[PDB]
Paper text:
EY-CBS (3,3′-ethyne-1,2-diylbis-{6-[(chloroacetyl)amino]benzenesulfonic acid}) is a chemical cross linker that can react simultaneously with two cysteines in the i and i+11 positions of the α-helix19.
Of the 21 fusion proteins, 16 failed to display any significant reactivity towards EY-CBS. We were unable to crystallize any of these proteins except 6,761, presumably due to the structural instability of the interface between the fused protein components. The structures of the two domains of the 6,761 fusion protein were easily superimposable with those of the separate protein A and calmodulin domains, and there were no noticeable structural changes except around the fusion site. In the crystal structure, it could be seen that the two helices designed to fuse had not formed a continuous helix, and the cysteines introduced to bind EY-CBS were close to one another and formed an unexpected disulfide bridge. The last and the first turns of the helices of the protein A and calmodulin domains, respectively, formed irregular loops and made sharp ∼120 degree turns. It appears that the 6,761 fusion protein can be crystallized because the interface between the two protein components of the fusion protein is stabilized by the opportunistic disulfide bridge. We conclude that that simple-minded ligation of two helices does not guarantee the formation of a single extended helix, and that high reactivity of the fusion helix with EY-CBS is a reliable indicator of helix formation.
Residue numbers in the entry: 217 to 267, 1005 to 1077
Amino acid sequence: NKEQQNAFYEILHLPNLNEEQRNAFIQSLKDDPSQSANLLAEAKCLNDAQAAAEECIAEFKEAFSLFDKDGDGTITTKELGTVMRSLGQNPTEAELQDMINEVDADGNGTIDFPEFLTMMARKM
Ligand SMILES: [Ca+2]
Ligand SMILES: [Ca+2]
């Protein structure tokens, strides 16, 4: 309860959060203060997505790692499928292909972290 306390305060005073959002980070950092640095980062991104670039990239990396299970810095068509069918969805292997193709810049059949970034940026 030393650097925890700091983050706590900082979240309290992040201007742009609404008080439902504020409340979320707060009581959740109470139940698990070991997670202090991570909740601050997420809120920092939530509050100013332009100003909190590193914190957004931070969180977005962990999102990447979720699909990129073998960790070769790339999301294959298979890894997409592997993740999705684990979520009870049943895609035809032709939609998995259309889903990668729809966010693939250099058109090499997979998805790199920069391409991943663009997709996130796009909606919103
Ligand atoms: Ca991979
Ligand atoms: Ca690519």
